[PDB]
Amino acid sequence: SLGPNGLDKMMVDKDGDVTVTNDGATILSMMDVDHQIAKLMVELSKSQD
Amino acid sequence: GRPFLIIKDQDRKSRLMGLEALKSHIMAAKAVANTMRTSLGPNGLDKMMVDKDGDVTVTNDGATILSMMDVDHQIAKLMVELSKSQDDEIGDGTTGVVVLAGALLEEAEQLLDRGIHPIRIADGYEQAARVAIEHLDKISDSVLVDIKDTEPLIQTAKTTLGSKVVNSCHRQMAEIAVNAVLTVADMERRDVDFELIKVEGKVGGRLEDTKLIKGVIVDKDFSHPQMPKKVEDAKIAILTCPFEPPKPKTKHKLDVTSVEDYKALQKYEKEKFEEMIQQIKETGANLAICQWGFDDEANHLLLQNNLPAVRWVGGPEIELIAIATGGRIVPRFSELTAEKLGFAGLVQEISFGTTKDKMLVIEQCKNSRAVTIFIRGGNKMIIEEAKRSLHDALCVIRNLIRDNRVVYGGGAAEISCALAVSQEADKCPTLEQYAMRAFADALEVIPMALSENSGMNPIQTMTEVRARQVKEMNPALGIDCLHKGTNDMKQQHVIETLIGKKQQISLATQMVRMILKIDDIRKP
Amino acid sequence: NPAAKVLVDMSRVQDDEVGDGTTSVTVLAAELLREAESLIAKKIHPQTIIAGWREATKAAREALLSSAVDHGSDEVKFRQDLMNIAGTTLSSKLLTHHKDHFTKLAVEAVLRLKGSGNLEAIHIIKKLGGSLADSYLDEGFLLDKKIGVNQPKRIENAKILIANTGMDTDKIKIFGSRVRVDSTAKVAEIEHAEKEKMKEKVERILKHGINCFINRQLIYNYPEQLFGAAGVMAIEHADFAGVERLALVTGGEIASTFDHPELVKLGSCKLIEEVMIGEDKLIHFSGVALGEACTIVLRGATQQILDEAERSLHDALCVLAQTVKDSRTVYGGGCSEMLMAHAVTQLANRTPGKEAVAMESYAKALRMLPTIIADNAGYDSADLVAQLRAAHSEGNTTAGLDMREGTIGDMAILGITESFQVKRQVLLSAAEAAEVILRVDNIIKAAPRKR
Amino acid sequence: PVNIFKAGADEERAETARLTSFIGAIAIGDLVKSTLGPKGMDKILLSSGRDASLMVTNDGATILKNIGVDNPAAKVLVDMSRVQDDEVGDGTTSVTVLAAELLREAESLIAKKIHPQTIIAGWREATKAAREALLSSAVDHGSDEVKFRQDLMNIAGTTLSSKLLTHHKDHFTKLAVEAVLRLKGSGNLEAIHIIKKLGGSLADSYLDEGFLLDKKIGVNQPKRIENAKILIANTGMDTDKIKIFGSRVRVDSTAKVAEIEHAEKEKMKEKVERILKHGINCFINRQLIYNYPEQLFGAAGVMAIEHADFAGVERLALVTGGEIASTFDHPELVKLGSCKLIEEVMIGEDKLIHFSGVALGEACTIVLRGATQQILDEAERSLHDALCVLAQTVKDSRTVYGGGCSEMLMAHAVTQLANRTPGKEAVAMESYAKALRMLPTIIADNAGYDSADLVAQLRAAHSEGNTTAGLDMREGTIGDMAILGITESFQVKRQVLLSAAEAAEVILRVDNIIKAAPRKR
Amino acid sequence: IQDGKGDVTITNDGATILKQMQVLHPAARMLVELSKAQDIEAGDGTTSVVIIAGSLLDSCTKLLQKGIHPTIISESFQKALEKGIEILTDMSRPVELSDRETLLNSATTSLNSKVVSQYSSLLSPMSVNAVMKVIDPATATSVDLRDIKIVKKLGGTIDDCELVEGLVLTQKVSNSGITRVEKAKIGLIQFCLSAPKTDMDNQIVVSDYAQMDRVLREERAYILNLVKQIKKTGCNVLLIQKSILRDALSDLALHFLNKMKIMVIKDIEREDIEFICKTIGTKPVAHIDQFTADMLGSAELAEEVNLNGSGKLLKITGCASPGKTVTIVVRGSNKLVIEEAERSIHDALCVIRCLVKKRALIAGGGAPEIELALRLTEYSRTLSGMESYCVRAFADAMEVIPSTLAENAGLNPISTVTELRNRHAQGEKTAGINVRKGGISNILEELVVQPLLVSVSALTLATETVRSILKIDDVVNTR
């Protein structure tokens, strides 16, 4: 997704809602994360945002 | 009275009776007839289907399609049986007759909702079939076919190959089929048995390679692969026994009470071997045609005798070799003589190059009786398609052995018979005109589905063609089969069988009359 | 899907015919069906497409045959074309990585054919290890069996006779015989009689005075001891292919009757001796009479390498034999394709009506192939295809995509000669299969054959 | 190389994701492509868990409304259709099928290993040029009453082709026109009333010269009144509770309770007389009323109307010239509603009260005496769409040309731009232009005409410069709508193209579909 | 008809029959809604209309195999509808509300298809007299069914179902004393005769022993005086509206009324009181201060009457108010014959309502359908093309229903079809199918007629429904 010509990501939450974005925190938050490093990195990108 | 078991196990017992049973019949049969629509006659498509064991087979030879189905309802199995009957009778209209039956039962279900006994409908169908076949026999033209003129037969087969992919070449097959029929026909008896022709095919090659060989093909190589491979004109013999010493078909215990008995037997063994060699070498025949194989001693001896032979040759191919060579059958060397030998035109070995198969052909200089047809194509689907198509063509020619075995088809016959049926039916009292008109409608069903399959604007096509063939009467104004204008069939000349259409009409009429009667049903 | 089985069957047919382009015909058929589904999505009568492709394919066949060139008038040019085609085949498979080491070698093998098929006459041997460069074609012949003790260990200039006889039990052709005696002395007498019958049979065979022997069936212990008493080399049971190869290379006969010691021809060779090949033993046969059948030695890092090497080289041998059968060739891949596309396009100019769009779709379908070639290379496609269309539209019918780099160049100097027969057959078969599969109207699956 | 998602959580970060999105998009496109042009055929949304509730519809808005999906791109397009229908009306069909064609273009382009940003920039520029060209071709009217009326007639007639009501177009389109005339230039949408009464024919329907009410009357109210002085109220009138609480009746004898009852009756009578001091012949109550107020009103003998609707009372206050009151100390500071006659009418098998000769006619009431509930529902949907289009074209007077005319205009402009543009973008834009060419094509496909012939003729005509060239849908020929009368809303097509552009922009810029693990159900 | 639940139904009108079934197929629902529409606009005829629609569907099926495009097919549908309008208009005739005999013929022909059809001898007067008492023989052109309320009672016989212009009350006199007064006086009360309660809480607090007796006597005197003011008019019957949260009747006041010999009836539903106002002219009283003779009516004789040994029900008759409301009692073996008689009476009522509504009668039997078919064939012959085939299909579709008329009357369909075709093809109209004789005959002497609107709505709604259906082409599964 890097660059002004970035290629955004569009994904669904557990309830059936569509979300498109390019930043990290909004991606990582509503991404279903099972591994614990995954949740650590969700926290990380959320702090950066 | 409380209900009680009268019929054994009425719990799992299912009964249907009355008009609803006829409704089930008509709906299933209409579904099947509409299932089998898009392969009509001179121009159509092919339906592909796989069976239980996972085999791909596609054709418009409708009988095969219906046969290879694991259908559920009984009437559909009856349809499959009817298709097999018509295929084993002529070999064309394998879908035409079933679509006609579907049309007849469409008419039957329409008139049924009008409140009339099915006996009336069956009687109307029978009378209409009578009239239709009578006029179809009035309209067919006799074809004077002799042994030196083949062009009408060539066009007959060419038109017959319509809607059948073999119309790629569309020309050479007609010629080779006519030549094969002429070579193998029994003219006086008017008989042609297809067991005399070894219909064979091998994948690869092209449809241009579709050829007729005026002889026999054999699929066994040399007993001595180092032995010289090809011989010109030769003399053959057919021995129905191996080269092993004669042991009886009764259980035998040959005692050996002495060492000199051992020497006598070990000498008698070879003595018999070279005695057989001398016997067969005396008669002068170049080739030996056996059935059960033999021992390597014979192989090396023939290597030192330079006399070609084969072994393990199967029964029917043995018989066909004997038929083609003109000789007789020699069970054992007692019958062996120079007289009954069979003369060979030329024999050669091929391996199809890249392949590792070996296959000997016998081409005869003198007169032959059993010919062979070989196929080259794209796959086993191509091979089987060509085989079944050419086989149906042979059936067509065998029917065509006689004269007047052709009338203009391509659907024009349907218009003509529908017109005759309507003309006869109109001059009738009531209670019958409805069924006869229904049969007439079933008759023009065929051109409608024809135009649909061609993709032509149907209703206007039939209207214009009907007007053209009504105002001036001729059996040749059918709809475009080559789709290039020129609907006058005295130009396109769709040349197809008479008895094929007549048998289709008869089968459909009898079958619908039969099905009309099953009004009460019982299943478990 | 039944169409998938149809495709794999057309692939198997094209594979058995020649090879090295089965992939091509499959891709071409699939791509034709891609334009077919597109055009039928434009609501077109299928029979029209079928007729259009039939006429277009006939015209393309005529044009390509017109472009066919015969060769073989000399040796150097024809041999160079053979190395060219061999290496071109090796490009399609992995053998490209050492194609040179293969090419000339392969040529020699096809030289030994001398007008006969049955590639089984060519022998291939694999042993794990070595290297692809270590692989080479034997300068003679090879056999893989074992020899007895009382037989010698080194021989030269042997005379060879072949046999397919039963010398294990001397089973008499009559079954039912049995000994009916009482005293076991008679049994000793009859057993000595059998042993002397075998001895006299060995004398019958040895009367030919051969220096080496082979039998297709098992050499039993008593026969082996009698041979050792003679003290000459005898080779035990083997296959049919081995004995046929030996008969070819030495000119002997597979003999099963030995009353004629001088009426037979003996196989000829000059040196027969084992060679310890790494962890294996193979006997070396140098100075054979006929250099017809050959044995190929293969070595590799993994057995999968050996398997694909044998597959690919079998394909190359098939193509080499096919081009030896007919010396009609055309120019390299795509260029012949692209000029056929040009001719079909010229017909499209001449083609009116609705069939025109179908046959021009056919044309661009053909044109798609070099695009895919360029994509597999890893270079820009549109520029090359448009530029080469311009090049072939000017009459420069010898230029084409460069094999060395993603550029454009003449393959006549570059050395890419294409076997006309193979790919005309490929085109015909692809057309036939495509029209067959397009003639469909209905798929009806039967029962799955309930377990 | 390690599992990181929850059970049921999926991520496709390859071309399989775009493949799934594209096949879902195509499944969307083909389902609706049968609902376009004058040749469209309607569809059924059949239910099984909704207790067998069905609705037939032609404007694909309801179709995308009633279908969900797991592929998020299809839901994105559903929301796009939501937006489109939120703006004006029909064209959801148009924008959705156009998006399908553009994504098919994207498929074909990705089939050549191209970085999509080039496509994005090229389509940006193409859209800019196309919008500029269309604005330069924006034909405007309204300077004359007859011209503007005929433009509205043309727009309405062309729009009814896309739906069922075309069978009585002359009896419908023109009628709808007068409705927006009654808006008197006000921007309100919620003045038109929609009425469904099964039975009768769509031609039996009519636009009454007044207003109607569908509420019960009081116990003793006159059936008919003339020159009605009308007042509208919203208070208790239900024994008019004092609104004060935390106050209790706490006595030791019931005579005081009797006096309290008499006093509350008197106070209610006082409220009634307070209202009657203003002086009216017709009273309106937005809500219920009690028996004692009803007896007082019957003593007055006036019309009291009970339990009305908030939107309806707002509409009627706009209509009859009064405004709702809640206090009545001022017989002098209120404006009274006015009507000529208020009578009774029986429609269908339901009872209505008829306003005849109303002092004003701002709001509208469209009665549909159709023949089935489902046809009634789709008829009300269609008239809602048509009146939205009418209001929008009254808002902005600029109009454009349909039948592909403006469409091939922008197509040819983009064609010339691509011709004067170097690089891949050009052919992309050309394909983009080709993409636009598919839209009228599908229209002809709905008719089933000689497709390629017609497309070639239109491209030739637009290359020649004939800027009014269009497709004749009556016979399958090529003519001028200026003769024919096929005109549409400039706003409509403009926003259709712009929304399609931005939807393509957002959809193409996707790389990884990640569906979260389902919660449960 | 029986459902998965306990109740069962017997019916002979296509509408309700269709209502009972529930099908997961959209076409069936479409037909059901069409039947609903025909009911709302007409009430009956659904006995045939859906079958006519299916006949048109099969008629257009053959055209569909013929390949005609659905749009042109729809245009032909519209044109056939338009032509059939005037084709129906042809053989109509004006009617009169003064002559009773044509009216009774209309009602009886409407009720040919009911279970109680043999009971038309008694029932033909009933529904008709119900209709005149509602609207005027002068200019009405508007009829409401809610002007009429019918009561259902189990037991008795069909012969006991009678029409009266009076008011029947399902409520019972709680007082077992005075239960019949002739020329009595009638009163209605909205408020609750109970202890005086306030809008907010009321707490009659007590701080002395004398206060209990004081308040008891005071409340007694209060209720006494209120009821005395009530009796001040000399009333003889009081109706008390049903009340909630409070007792509309007072036990002490109940004894007071028992002492003063006035019938006491309470718990009267909120709505039909206006019906009562429309019935007997009485007007509600919401406060005793309001109470005045102006909201009091007069009656001749009202009593709690017996059902011949089947319970007691309250009846009121003989009031001088020229009301426009009626009621009919229904008795019979079980509730099933009750439903049958109810539906037959409702069909007759709706038929007469439409007849007065749109005064235009059309002969039934066989003449209409055959005239349609003949004229539509000769119209099809005049318009060659795919139009001609479609119009011939229309002309052949209409003959399905008369074929059923022959069939279910125990006759061969085709023979009767031929006979009607021949007879009406010779210009001999009025050729109706005779159920009794079993053939074609002059339908005029057969007394078989129906209003124009019945068939007009039938075919118009059928045509539009068919057109919408063919405009329907795709289905997608939802939740």
Side-chain angles (χ1 to χ4, degrees), chain E residues 117-129:
Chain E
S117 183
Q118 57 276 44
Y119 296 96
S120 304
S121 74
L122 175 65
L123 266 53
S124 167
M126 295 298 102
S127 304
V128 165
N129 305 346

mmCIF file with all atom_site columns, all heavy atoms in Angstrom, chain E residues 117-129:
data_model
loop_
_atom_site.group_PDB
_atom_site.id
_atom_site.type_symbol
_atom_site.label_atom_id
_atom_site.label_alt_id
_atom_site.label_comp_id
_atom_site.label_asym_id
_atom_site.label_entity_id
_atom_site.label_seq_id
_atom_site.pdbx_PDB_ins_code
_atom_site.Cartn_x
_atom_site.Cartn_y
_atom_site.Cartn_z
_atom_site.occupancy
_atom_site.B_iso_or_equiv
_atom_site.pdbx_formal_charge
_atom_site.auth_seq_id
_atom_site.auth_comp_id
_atom_site.auth_asym_id
_atom_site.auth_atom_id
_atom_site.pdbx_PDB_model_num
ATOM 1  N N   . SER E 1 117 ? -78.068 -22.722 -2.155 1.00 0.00 ? 117 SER E N   1
ATOM 2  C CA  . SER E 1 117 ? -78.749 -22.305 -3.380 1.00 0.00 ? 117 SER E CA  1
ATOM 3  C C   . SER E 1 117 ? -80.185 -22.807 -3.438 1.00 0.00 ? 117 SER E C   1
ATOM 4  O O   . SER E 1 117 ? -81.070 -22.100 -3.935 1.00 0.00 ? 117 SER E O   1
ATOM 5  C CB  . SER E 1 117 ? -77.974 -22.791 -4.606 1.00 0.00 ? 117 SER E CB  1
ATOM 6  O OG  . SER E 1 117 ? -78.579 -22.343 -5.806 1.00 0.00 ? 117 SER E OG  1
ATOM 7  N N   . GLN E 1 118 ? -80.439 -24.017 -2.939 1.00 0.00 ? 118 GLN E N   1
ATOM 8  C CA  . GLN E 1 118 ? -81.799 -24.537 -2.863 1.00 0.00 ? 118 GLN E CA  1
ATOM 9  C C   . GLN E 1 118 ? -82.670 -23.753 -1.893 1.00 0.00 ? 118 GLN E C   1
ATOM 10 O O   . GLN E 1 118 ? -83.899 -23.828 -1.989 1.00 0.00 ? 118 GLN E O   1
ATOM 11 C CB  . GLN E 1 118 ? -81.769 -26.012 -2.456 1.00 0.00 ? 118 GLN E CB  1
ATOM 12 C CG  . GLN E 1 118 ? -81.047 -26.278 -1.141 1.00 0.00 ? 118 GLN E CG  1
ATOM 13 C CD  . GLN E 1 118 ? -79.546 -26.402 -1.306 1.00 0.00 ? 118 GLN E CD  1
ATOM 14 O OE1 . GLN E 1 118 ? -78.921 -25.609 -2.008 1.00 0.00 ? 118 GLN E OE1 1
ATOM 15 N NE2 . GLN E 1 118 ? -78.959 -27.397 -0.655 1.00 0.00 ? 118 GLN E NE2 1
ATOM 16 N N   . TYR E 1 119 ? -82.066 -23.011 -0.966 1.00 0.00 ? 119 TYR E N   1
ATOM 17 C CA  . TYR E 1 119 ? -82.789 -22.196 -0.001 1.00 0.00 ? 119 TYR E CA  1
ATOM 18 C C   . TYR E 1 119 ? -83.024 -20.778 -0.500 1.00 0.00 ? 119 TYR E C   1
ATOM 19 O O   . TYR E 1 119 ? -83.338 -19.891 0.300  1.00 0.00 ? 119 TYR E O   1
ATOM 20 C CB  . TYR E 1 119 ? -82.032 -22.171 1.327  1.00 0.00 ? 119 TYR E CB  1
ATOM 21 C CG  . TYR E 1 119 ? -81.947 -23.526 1.974  1.00 0.00 ? 119 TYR E CG  1
ATOM 22 C CD1 . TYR E 1 119 ? -80.830 -24.330 1.803  1.00 0.00 ? 119 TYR E CD1 1
ATOM 23 C CD2 . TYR E 1 119 ? -82.996 -24.016 2.736  1.00 0.00 ? 119 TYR E CD2 1
ATOM 24 C CE1 . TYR E 1 119 ? -80.757 -25.577 2.385  1.00 0.00 ? 119 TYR E CE1 1
ATOM 25 C CE2 . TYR E 1 119 ? -82.933 -25.260 3.324  1.00 0.00 ? 119 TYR E CE2 1
ATOM 26 C CZ  . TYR E 1 119 ? -81.813 -26.039 3.144  1.00 0.00 ? 119 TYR E CZ  1
ATOM 27 O OH  . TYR E 1 119 ? -81.749 -27.282 3.731  1.00 0.00 ? 119 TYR E OH  1
ATOM 28 N N   . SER E 1 120 ? -82.872 -20.546 -1.806 1.00 0.00 ? 120 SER E N   1
ATOM 29 C CA  . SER E 1 120 ? -83.071 -19.211 -2.353 1.00 0.00 ? 120 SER E CA  1
ATOM 30 C C   . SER E 1 120 ? -84.503 -18.733 -2.162 1.00 0.00 ? 120 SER E C   1
ATOM 31 O O   . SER E 1 120 ? -84.750 -17.524 -2.124 1.00 0.00 ? 120 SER E O   1
ATOM 32 C CB  . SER E 1 120 ? -82.697 -19.194 -3.834 1.00 0.00 ? 120 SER E CB  1
ATOM 33 O OG  . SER E 1 120 ? -81.370 -19.652 -4.025 1.00 0.00 ? 120 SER E OG  1
ATOM 34 N N   . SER E 1 121 ? -85.452 -19.664 -2.033 1.00 0.00 ? 121 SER E N   1
ATOM 35 C CA  . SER E 1 121 ? -86.852 -19.307 -1.839 1.00 0.00 ? 121 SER E CA  1
ATOM 36 C C   . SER E 1 121 ? -87.029 -18.359 -0.662 1.00 0.00 ? 121 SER E C   1
ATOM 37 O O   . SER E 1 121 ? -87.787 -17.387 -0.734 1.00 0.00 ? 121 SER E O   1
ATOM 38 C CB  . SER E 1 121 ? -87.676 -20.576 -1.623 1.00 0.00 ? 121 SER E CB  1
ATOM 39 O OG  . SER E 1 121 ? -87.445 -21.104 -0.329 1.00 0.00 ? 121 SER E OG  1
ATOM 40 N N   . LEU E 1 122 ? -86.332 -18.635 0.436  1.00 0.00 ? 122 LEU E N   1
ATOM 41 C CA  . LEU E 1 122 ? -86.385 -17.771 1.604  1.00 0.00 ? 122 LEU E CA  1
ATOM 42 C C   . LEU E 1 122 ? -85.338 -16.668 1.566  1.00 0.00 ? 122 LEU E C   1
ATOM 43 O O   . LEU E 1 122 ? -85.602 -15.556 2.039  1.00 0.00 ? 122 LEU E O   1
ATOM 44 C CB  . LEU E 1 122 ? -86.202 -18.603 2.876  1.00 0.00 ? 122 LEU E CB  1
ATOM 45 C CG  . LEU E 1 122 ? -86.109 -17.833 4.195  1.00 0.00 ? 122 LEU E CG  1
ATOM 46 C CD1 . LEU E 1 122 ? -87.416 -17.114 4.485  1.00 0.00 ? 122 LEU E CD1 1
ATOM 47 C CD2 . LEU E 1 122 ? -85.730 -18.761 5.340  1.00 0.00 ? 122 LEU E CD2 1
ATOM 48 N N   . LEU E 1 123 ? -84.164 -16.940 1.000  1.00 0.00 ? 123 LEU E N   1
ATOM 49 C CA  . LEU E 1 123 ? -83.033 -16.033 1.134  1.00 0.00 ? 123 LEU E CA  1
ATOM 50 C C   . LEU E 1 123 ? -83.046 -14.892 0.129  1.00 0.00 ? 123 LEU E C   1
ATOM 51 O O   . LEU E 1 123 ? -82.486 -13.827 0.413  1.00 0.00 ? 123 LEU E O   1
ATOM 52 C CB  . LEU E 1 123 ? -81.719 -16.807 1.004  1.00 0.00 ? 123 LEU E CB  1
ATOM 53 C CG  . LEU E 1 123 ? -81.085 -17.269 2.319  1.00 0.00 ? 123 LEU E CG  1
ATOM 54 C CD1 . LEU E 1 123 ? -82.078 -18.052 3.166  1.00 0.00 ? 123 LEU E CD1 1
ATOM 55 C CD2 . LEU E 1 123 ? -79.840 -18.094 2.047  1.00 0.00 ? 123 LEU E CD2 1
ATOM 56 N N   . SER E 1 124 ? -83.659 -15.088 -1.038 1.00 0.00 ? 124 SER E N   1
ATOM 57 C CA  . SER E 1 124 ? -83.722 -14.010 -2.017 1.00 0.00 ? 124 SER E CA  1
ATOM 58 C C   . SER E 1 124 ? -84.379 -12.742 -1.476 1.00 0.00 ? 124 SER E C   1
ATOM 59 O O   . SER E 1 124 ? -83.853 -11.653 -1.758 1.00 0.00 ? 124 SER E O   1
ATOM 60 C CB  . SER E 1 124 ? -84.440 -14.502 -3.284 1.00 0.00 ? 124 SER E CB  1
ATOM 61 O OG  . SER E 1 124 ? -84.784 -13.416 -4.127 1.00 0.00 ? 124 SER E OG  1
ATOM 62 N N   . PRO E 1 125 ? -85.493 -12.793 -0.737 1.00 0.00 ? 125 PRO E N   1
ATOM 63 C CA  . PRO E 1 125 ? -85.987 -11.554 -0.114 1.00 0.00 ? 125 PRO E CA  1
ATOM 64 C C   . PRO E 1 125 ? -85.011 -10.941 0.873  1.00 0.00 ? 125 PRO E C   1
ATOM 65 O O   . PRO E 1 125 ? -84.939 -9.712  0.982  1.00 0.00 ? 125 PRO E O   1
ATOM 66 C CB  . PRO E 1 125 ? -87.277 -12.006 0.583  1.00 0.00 ? 125 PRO E CB  1
ATOM 67 C CG  . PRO E 1 125 ? -87.698 -13.227 -0.143 1.00 0.00 ? 125 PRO E CG  1
ATOM 68 C CD  . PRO E 1 125 ? -86.435 -13.911 -0.546 1.00 0.00 ? 125 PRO E CD  1
ATOM 69 N N   . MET E 1 126 ? -84.251 -11.767 1.593  1.00 0.00 ? 126 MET E N   1
ATOM 70 C CA  . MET E 1 126 ? -83.519 -11.286 2.760  1.00 0.00 ? 126 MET E CA  1
ATOM 71 C C   . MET E 1 126 ? -82.430 -10.293 2.370  1.00 0.00 ? 126 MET E C   1
ATOM 72 O O   . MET E 1 126 ? -82.424 -9.145  2.827  1.00 0.00 ? 126 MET E O   1
ATOM 73 C CB  . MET E 1 126 ? -82.926 -12.471 3.520  1.00 0.00 ? 126 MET E CB  1
ATOM 74 C CG  . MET E 1 126 ? -83.968 -13.400 4.126  1.00 0.00 ? 126 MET E CG  1
ATOM 75 S SD  . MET E 1 126 ? -85.032 -12.603 5.348  1.00 0.00 ? 126 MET E SD  1
ATOM 76 C CE  . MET E 1 126 ? -86.525 -12.342 4.391  1.00 0.00 ? 126 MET E CE  1
ATOM 77 N N   . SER E 1 127 ? -81.492 -10.725 1.525  1.00 0.00 ? 127 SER E N   1
ATOM 78 C CA  . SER E 1 127 ? -80.389 -9.852  1.141  1.00 0.00 ? 127 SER E CA  1
ATOM 79 C C   . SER E 1 127 ? -80.895 -8.614  0.416  1.00 0.00 ? 127 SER E C   1
ATOM 80 O O   . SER E 1 127 ? -80.366 -7.512  0.601  1.00 0.00 ? 127 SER E O   1
ATOM 81 C CB  . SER E 1 127 ? -79.402 -10.620 0.264  1.00 0.00 ? 127 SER E CB  1
ATOM 82 O OG  . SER E 1 127 ? -78.946 -11.789 0.921  1.00 0.00 ? 127 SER E OG  1
ATOM 83 N N   . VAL E 1 128 ? -81.930 -8.774  -0.409 1.00 0.00 ? 128 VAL E N   1
ATOM 84 C CA  . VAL E 1 128 ? -82.459 -7.647  -1.170 1.00 0.00 ? 128 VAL E CA  1
ATOM 85 C C   . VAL E 1 128 ? -83.034 -6.593  -0.228 1.00 0.00 ? 128 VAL E C   1
ATOM 86 O O   . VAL E 1 128 ? -82.668 -5.410  -0.287 1.00 0.00 ? 128 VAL E O   1
ATOM 87 C CB  . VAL E 1 128 ? -83.500 -8.153  -2.185 1.00 0.00 ? 128 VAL E CB  1
ATOM 88 C CG1 . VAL E 1 128 ? -84.330 -7.027  -2.726 1.00 0.00 ? 128 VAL E CG1 1
ATOM 89 C CG2 . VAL E 1 128 ? -82.803 -8.884  -3.318 1.00 0.00 ? 128 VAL E CG2 1
ATOM 90 N N   . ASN E 1 129 ? -83.901 -7.019  0.697  1.00 0.00 ? 129 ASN E N   1
ATOM 91 C CA  . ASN E 1 129 ? -84.454 -6.090  1.676  1.00 0.00 ? 129 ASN E CA  1
ATOM 92 C C   . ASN E 1 129 ? -83.355 -5.480  2.530  1.00 0.00 ? 129 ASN E C   1
ATOM 93 O O   . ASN E 1 129 ? -83.468 -4.333  2.978  1.00 0.00 ? 129 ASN E O   1
ATOM 94 C CB  . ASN E 1 129 ? -85.483 -6.801  2.554  1.00 0.00 ? 129 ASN E CB  1
ATOM 95 C CG  . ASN E 1 129 ? -86.570 -7.468  1.746  1.00 0.00 ? 129 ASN E CG  1
ATOM 96 O OD1 . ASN E 1 129 ? -86.724 -7.203  0.554  1.00 0.00 ? 129 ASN E OD1 1
ATOM 97 N ND2 . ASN E 1 129 ? -87.330 -8.346  2.388  1.00 0.00 ? 129 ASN E ND2 1
#
